[PDB]
């Protein structure tokens, strides 16, 4: 679980933060 | 003409205070005046809201003097020299409650408000 | 540190009580506690005490009859009007009978019942019943 | 200059006060009286006294600490100093924020907080 979520949250964050940074 | 009060400036704590009413008649005010040195006397009577007529001097030609016994006169004056407030005023001869002026013999110090009372007399300065 | 030395007296005295030892020892000692035990004895709740004043401290050795149920100090020590007494009457005490809500007063120190008979009040100090 | 002020207090040892003191002119002593402590002397003839009082809260049964600054005009006959009680008169306005004049000073070298 919290492994999952942390990396899902991180990937969401990055990918989206990539989309914001871009 | 001048509005005020005077509740419409700022708070002593840097708040903005906003007016939450309008004008009140009783609480309006008039503008300052220039009482000139001249040979003629230009007066006007004006009616206050307390219901009392008060004289405004718009010019004058006689002040005149007092000692430390107090023997008054009505005689000629000449140029206003030294006004406390601003030296600009001492050029255009604006009489004030604390003005200083040249009289016939000795300099004399004004000691009355001619913008509500309508009077000009002085007391001699001793060197 | 300590504070409320009284209270740390009282609280022993009660936890002392609840066990059913014979007598107590209270290492820190004072007027407050001294006086309060005095008034306490005056109502009778306790038997006899001796304090020995050591160059360190007063100590009270107190004799336990069995009477006391619960006797506790007040936390912020509230001021209480003589009209508000009845409220503080119903709350803290167990019923109308007991009446040692020990307050501190203009006259000195008293219980609740000794306060009411005079007629005077103030800030609360402790309770006993 | 130097006349009895009443309140059961004595007037300053020296006098030479300007017309914004109740020993001259048309500004006069009247009314209620307080006491408080000098924060600052920095403005000219002007001194901050901040009072401490307690207030009650009915909900919690307890008190609170509140602190009301009051602006006080010091007469040039006497100088205020930090950290001493000062006595205040209730008078008509000097200014936007100055409604008070200092009447009788009890001065002190001591300071807490």
């Amino acid at each position: 679980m919290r492994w999952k979520w942390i990396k899902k949250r991180i990937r969401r964050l990055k990918r989206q933060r990539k989309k914001e940074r871009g | 003409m001048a509005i005020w009060q005077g509740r419409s400036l700022k708070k002593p704590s840097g708040g903005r205070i906003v007016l939450a009413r309008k004008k009140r008649k009783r609480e309006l005010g008039r503008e300052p005046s220039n009482t000139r040195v001249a040979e003629q006397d230009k007066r006007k009577i004006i009616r206050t809201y307390g219901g009392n007529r008060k004289v405004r001097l718009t010019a004058a030609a006689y002040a005149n003097v007092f000692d430390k016994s107090g023997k008054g006169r009505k005689v000629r004056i000449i140029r206003v020299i030294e006004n406390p407030a601003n030296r600009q005023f001492a050029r255009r001869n604006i009489i004030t409650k604390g003005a200083i002026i040249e009289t016939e013999i000795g300099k004399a110090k004004v000691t009355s408000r001619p913008g509500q009372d309508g009077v000009v007399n002085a007391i001699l300065l001793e060197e | 540190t300590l504070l409320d030395p009284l209270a740390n007296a009282l609280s022993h005295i009660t936890n002392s009580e609840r066990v059913g030892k014979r007598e107590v020892y209270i290492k820190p000692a004072s007027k407050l506690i001294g006086e309060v035990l005095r008034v306490m004895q005056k109502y009778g709740y306790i038997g006899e005490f001796e304090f020995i004043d050591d160059g360190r401290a007063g100590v009270y050795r107190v004799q336990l009859l069995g009477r006391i149920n619960k006797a506790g100090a007040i936390k912020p020590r509230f001021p209480v009007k003589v009209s508000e007494f009845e409220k503080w009457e119903k709350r803290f005490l167990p019923a109308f009978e007991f009446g040692i809500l020990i307050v501190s007063t203009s006259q000195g120190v008293m219980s609740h019942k000794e306060a009411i008979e005079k007629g005077i009040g103030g800030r609360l100090i402790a309770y006993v019943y | 200059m130097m006349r009895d002020i009443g309140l059961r207090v004595q007037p300053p040892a020296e006098k030479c006060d300007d017309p914004k003191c109740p020993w001259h002119g048309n500004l006069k002593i009247h009314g209620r009286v307080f006491e408080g402590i000098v924060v600052s002397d920095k403005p000219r003839k002007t001194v901050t006294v901040e009072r401490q009082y307690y207030f009650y809260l009915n909900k919690y049964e307890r008190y609170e600490l509140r602190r009301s600054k009051i602006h006080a005009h010091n007469p040039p006959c006497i100088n205020a100093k930090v950290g001493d009680k000062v006595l205040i008169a209730e008078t008509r306005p000097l200014s936007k924020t100055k409604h008070f004049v200092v009447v009788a000073v009890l001065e002190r070298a001591e300071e807490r907080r």
Binding site: - | - | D54, G55, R56 | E111, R112
Partner: protein
């Protein structure tokens, strides 16, 4: 009894004599006692150790009990015996020993700086000084104009 400060460990239970007036099987005059004190402060010993040697050699456990009454304003004891003579350090010994030590630390750290623990007691000794300062100011052994710092610690010691 205890206070586990910067520790979890209960403090020593060392305890005073419950004597309130002094032994008379021990015998010294107000004059003799005063000499003993002055001699020891002349050595370079300090008041705790002065009270220590007097205890171990001359058999007086605390000075207050023996001396007072001889001017019953208060108890007469070592440094109050010293101040009347002018032998007292204007800094209280408490505050002095403290600061004294402190300046020694700094020199170690100077040369050795990779020291957690040694760094961490610098922080633990200053902050006792600070306190000891703070209250004295208000009591008055140290003027209110002072404030504590590591250059104003290296000046008091030298």
């Amino acid at each position: 009894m205890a206070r586990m400060h910067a520790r979890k460990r209960g403090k020593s239970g060392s305890k005073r004599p419950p004597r309130t007036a002094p032994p008379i099987w021990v015998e010294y005059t107000v004059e003799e006692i005063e000499n003993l004190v002055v001699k020891l402060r002349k050595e370079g010993y300090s008041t705790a150790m002065i009270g220590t040697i007097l205890r171990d050699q001359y058999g007086i456990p605390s000075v207050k009990l023996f001396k007072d009454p001889d001017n019953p304003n208060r108890n007469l004891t070592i440094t109050r015996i010293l101040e009347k003579h002018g032998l007292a350090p204007e800094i209280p010994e408490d505050l002095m020993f403290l600061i004294r030590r402190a300046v020694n630390l700094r020199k170690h750290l100077e040369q050795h700086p990779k020291d957690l623990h040694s760094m961490r007691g610098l922080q633990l000794i200053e902050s006792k000084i600070r306190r000891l300062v703070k209250y004295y100011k208000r009591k008055g052994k140290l003027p209110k104009n002072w404030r504590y710092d590591p250059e104003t610690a290296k000046l008091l010691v030298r």
